[PDB]
From a paper:
Among families of proteins involved in signal transduction, phospholipase C (PLC) enzymes that generate second messengers from phosphatidylinositol 4,5-bisphosphate (PIP2) incorporate a number of different protein modules. PLCγ enzymes (PLCγ1 and PLCγ2), for example, contain eight domains, four of which are unique to this PLC family (Bunney and Katan, 2011; Suh et al., 2008).
In addition, we solved the structure of the tandem nSH2-cSH2 pair by X-ray crystallography. Based on the determination of the crystal structure of the PLCγ1 tandem nSH2-cSH2 domains in nonliganded form (left), suggesting that these [name] domains might possess limited intramolecular flexibility with respect to each other, we directly tested this hypothesis. We recorded 15N relaxation data on the tandem and isolated [name] domains.
Residue numbers in the entry: 547 to 558, 560 to 772, 783 to 789
The structure:
Amino acid sequence: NEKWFHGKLGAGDGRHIAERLLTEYCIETGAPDGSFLVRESETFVGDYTLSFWRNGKVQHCRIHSRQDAGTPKFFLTDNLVFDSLYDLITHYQQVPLRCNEFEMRLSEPVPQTNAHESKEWYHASLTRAQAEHMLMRVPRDGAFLVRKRNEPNSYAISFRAEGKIKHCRVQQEGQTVMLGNSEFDSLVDLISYYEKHPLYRKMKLRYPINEEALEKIGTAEPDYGYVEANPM
């Protein structure tokens, strides 16, 4: 499901963010040479760049994108042309890339750590009091949100459990997120697990809260009523 596709990386700092992302994944996990990602190009409108690992250095290759006869054509060199980025990546995963100086096959994909950012339950800027206030407006067990904390790589799941509002501390520790001692690959994956399994005393993550969700359910400032999550 396009794990290696990162889209736009802020602005056209995108090259440096790619490099950072790759150095982080490759050094923490001990990834092989050829570990990569695809993102939008900084210099070439409508093209992409394939950024990959080479023993501490990262190589950038332009993936030219044509619309010829209303049929997208992604390619690295005029000689070999593809129909999808999946085919190109999957082909260069098997056949080695020719880059003049060296040759290299694409290895493992470097995944995004920030898919949570677009999710409805995610607030990049919400104090604990602001989470509590919004959670008081939803008198429902299972109502939740994920809020970013002031420190980098630190979050909280703020939820309504048995009428009270409690808070769980989540920590991004490199390429995984930690909830106490429980480890997940991402904040997204943690939330999916806790939508199916109880986060705190038989309470699952049921209703994601934001301003739109409040217009639907939500009331007008009612009920004036950190915690350990369930392991596994």
